[PDB]
Design a protein around this nucleic acid. Sequence first.
RNA 1: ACCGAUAGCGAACUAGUACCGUGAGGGAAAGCUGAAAAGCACCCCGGGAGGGGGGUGAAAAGAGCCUGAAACCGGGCGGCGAUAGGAGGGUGCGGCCCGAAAGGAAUGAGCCUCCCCGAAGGAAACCGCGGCGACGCGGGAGUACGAGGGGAGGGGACCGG
RNA 2: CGGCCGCCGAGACCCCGGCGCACGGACCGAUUGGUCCGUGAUCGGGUAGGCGGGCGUGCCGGUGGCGUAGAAGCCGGGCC
RNA 3: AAUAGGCGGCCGUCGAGGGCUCGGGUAGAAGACCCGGU
Lengths: 86, 364, 142, 152
Amino acid sequence: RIKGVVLSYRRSKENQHNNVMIIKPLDVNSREEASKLIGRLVLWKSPSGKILKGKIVRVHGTKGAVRARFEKGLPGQALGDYVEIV
Amino acid sequence: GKVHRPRRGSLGFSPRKRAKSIVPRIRSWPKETEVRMLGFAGYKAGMTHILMIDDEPGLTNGKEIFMPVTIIETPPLRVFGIRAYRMGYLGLETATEVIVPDFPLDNYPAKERKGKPKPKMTFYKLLERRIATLPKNYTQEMFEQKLGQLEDMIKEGEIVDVRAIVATQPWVIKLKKKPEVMEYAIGGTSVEEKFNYIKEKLGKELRVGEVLKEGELLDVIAVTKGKGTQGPVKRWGIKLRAHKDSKGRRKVGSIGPWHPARVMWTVPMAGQMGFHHRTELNKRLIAIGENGKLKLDENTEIEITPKGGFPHYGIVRSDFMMIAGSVPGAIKRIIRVRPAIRPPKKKPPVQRPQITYVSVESKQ
Amino acid sequence: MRIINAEGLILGRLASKVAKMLLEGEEVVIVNAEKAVITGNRDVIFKKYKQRTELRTLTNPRRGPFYPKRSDEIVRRTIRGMLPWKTDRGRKAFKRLKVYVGIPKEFQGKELETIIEAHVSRLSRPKYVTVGEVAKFLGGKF
Amino acid sequence: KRFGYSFQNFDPKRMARASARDLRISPKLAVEVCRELRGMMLNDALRYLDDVIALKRPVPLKRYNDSQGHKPGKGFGPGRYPVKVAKAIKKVLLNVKNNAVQKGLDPDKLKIIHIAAHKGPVLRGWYPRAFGRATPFNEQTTHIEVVVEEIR
RNA sequence: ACCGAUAGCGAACUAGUACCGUGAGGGAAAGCUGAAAAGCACCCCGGGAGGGGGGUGAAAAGAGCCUGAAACCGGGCGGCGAUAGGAGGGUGCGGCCCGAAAGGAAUGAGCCUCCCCGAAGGAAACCGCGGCGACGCGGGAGUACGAGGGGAGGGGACCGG
RNA sequence: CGGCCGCCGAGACCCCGGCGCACGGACCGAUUGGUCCGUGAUCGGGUAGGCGGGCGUGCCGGUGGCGUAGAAGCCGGGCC
RNA sequence: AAUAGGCGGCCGUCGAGGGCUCGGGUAGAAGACCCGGU
């Protein structure tokens, strides 16, 4: 399993997409390293213990961030929070 | 063009609010090399006048002149605490404070009433009227250990300042019983010297004669007489409106322009007047008298109390100060004095001036 | 918690990196705020900071912009300027920052990180004025 | 019978109730006094009302307190002495105590578990004003309801 | 094939009445207990008005009377609540709370595991080469993945709102 | 300033599923229509304005019914 | 002073301390503040 940090939504300057999130894994720093994680699940834990599920679908940028699509969007209190890959 | 004039009042004393405490605070201390406590405290008694041969530089030098003076009753203070200050991140921070254990009180004016013996007062009983939570089972041995710990910290060098915690003794002059607790700095450049100075007088009495010198300049700190709520005419000295004004004459006309669309804080308004913390600079200490008496020429001694007593005050019975001019505060108000912090370049000589007459006539 | 030695670091780049870390959700302590540098002309920098300190509300000084005069406060305000200060996320990110002048006793003997993207070795010529000099000109304590 | 109570869980075996209708007192001050008296024991509430009538204890104002001066002591704050409202509520409390006693409950174990004041019908009147204007001059009445319970 | 008490004549009623103007003249508002008064006997409290018991009635419908909406006011419950800024809302979800019926559901819910197909789109490890460099090109490979469309196993009460 | 490299970014463009519309076709309705298929890169914003369909209310002529085992009305919810 | 401070002392895991009430102003528009209370 891997640990990751939720950076932000997929967004333009003034537009936000609620069901796609940008996640930075701990020890990945390139597209080449990040591409190995495509197809793996991402789990977020609510304060009450509820689990929200998403899946990594694409790489983002060139610094190792990835795009995760969630069936139910993250609340937004998950920004800057920790998620579990697999 | 328009007509110019200085603004009404000063903005350097804002907010004009009631003083935080009736006991004055001292923010700055003078720099001195002599190891002595930098100031004293007393109670305002009244005003009188004298005729004296002037010794200050000026046109009227050597000529007998009229001089108003204020009498401040200064019973000896009780030195009962020592506080140490270290250097914090943003300024001085107190590191420790040690007070002396309880001792019997002998200057309390006990009186025999019908039944019961002398009350036999002790310390920590008058102090309880101010602190209300004093150490229990406090012993001389424990006090010695605390003092030794403070001294060891001084030797280690974590302490950058030391100050003396003193208490007034109004019961000596029968003014009241609740004391005023104040903190005073000690002149010098050695923390060890200041610590020894405080330690040798911990638990003792300090008199104004052992502290201040006759003829020197002082800064006087007190809380001025309260006037309640006062309008702008008296508070800021604005001009009365035209006599044909049908909405009033004792008010400001325009409280601001169209823009900015707000009332500026600089517009005079009614509010609290008096009872403000104030400091007066360069007041000469004319003389120091003992036991309510002043000696003149080694054969004449007079009572500073006027005939019939001071108005709204009793009779002076303890050591007192004669301060040239007037001082802020009301009668019986606590007054603090310190050595002058910004004296003039050409100061008067440090000695009592030649006094030819002292008024002791009825002041009521 | 990451400790950054601000000695010989460009103020703007250091502030940008630190604001980024705070937004990602880390705790940052800057330990040598007085030794950060600002490139440019000394007189121009001093005039800019003097005007910044002179900004105030006319109707009430108690509401006016309280632009800093100390070195650590200058660094803190520079970092705050690069954060979404008007949002809860920005306020929380700013609450995770501490700035000090000199090494405090609690941080002695610890690891001090540095940012190679903000070091003064990048400059062609070393024409800069330290935040300590700026604070000294402005009249701050340090 | 004519008017109902807002209390929902009334238990005749352990509780007693009383009310007063169309009282010519201030509904706002009645609300303030009822808020002060809610949750208190019956004897303590009677002593509270006696103190308020005797002017030895102010009633704080939390909702209707415009242009009201403060009072000595902690928690003040605006306060006043609604003597008329206190007297009416004291009469209602005496009635509820009598009802509880007639039921058979101990008067020394009664706690005020419900007390409320409502605006009632408005008695209309007019007062003449300048420039030939007739202007309303009305009286607002108050309904008081109280339910007390015996604690064990 | 008119209206159904702000409608219909101004007036469904002690209505051209009350009331306004010196005067010609002007001119309202206002319907409903119950099948039957059976319209609350008696007890406690209160100066009274009334309050609490107890009775009548299929039902208080209690005369301040058929139903009793909205605005407004008081109390109870759920949520927020004294360092936070936008016309009070929009998209998504999280925390707390409700959740019998009318929605799905023990003929199986959220949930967990595994297998097949798959549009537009679409990586990378590694190997070889070009470029001063950011990087790119051929293979890997149209592979992993991919909206959605199907199947099997486990568990046993939620999901929608 | 003269050039280059890689990324990010709309309801635009591409793909799957659904709705309506315009035109043509088949089949079926005792008063304007209904079901289904085919084409739409060359249909889908909209003020003034024109045109078509549909929802709701009182009463009349018919037709089929509900209701004291509870009508109308009102309050809070589920579904379409 | 949201980094919302330091120190001495008393108290809690019945109880330190305080308020109303009392006699008066070094104070006062209500609050507040200050002295005294065997």
